[PDB]
Amino acid sequence: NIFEMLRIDEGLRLKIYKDTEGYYTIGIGHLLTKSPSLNAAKSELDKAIGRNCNGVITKDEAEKLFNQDVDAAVRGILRNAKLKPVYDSLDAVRRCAAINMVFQMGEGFTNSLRMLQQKRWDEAAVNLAKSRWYNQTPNRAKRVITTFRTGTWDAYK
Ligand X SMILES: C=C(C)Cc1ccccc1
User: Which residues in this chain contact ligand X in the complex, by CB under 6 A?
Assistant: 77, 83, 86-87, 98, 101-102, 109, 112-113, 116
Q: Which residues contact 117 (CB under 8 A, 6 or more apart)?
A: 85, 86, 89
- Is residue 10 part of the annotated active site? The answer reads yes
- How near is the Cβ of 114 to ligand X at its closest, in Å? 9
Q: Nearest Cα to 156, choosing from 146, 148, 120?
A: 146
Of 112 and 137, CB closest to ligand X: 112
Contact 119, 151 (CB under 8 A): no
Of 31 and 101, CB closest to ligand X: 101
Contact 116, 90 (CB under 8 A): yes
d(CA 7, CA 19): 14
Options 9, 10, 61, 69, the catalytic residue = 10
- How near is the Cβ of 1 to ligand X at its closest, in Å? 17
Of 62 and 116, CB closest to ligand X: 116
- How near is the Cβ of 138 to ligand X at its closest, in Å? 16
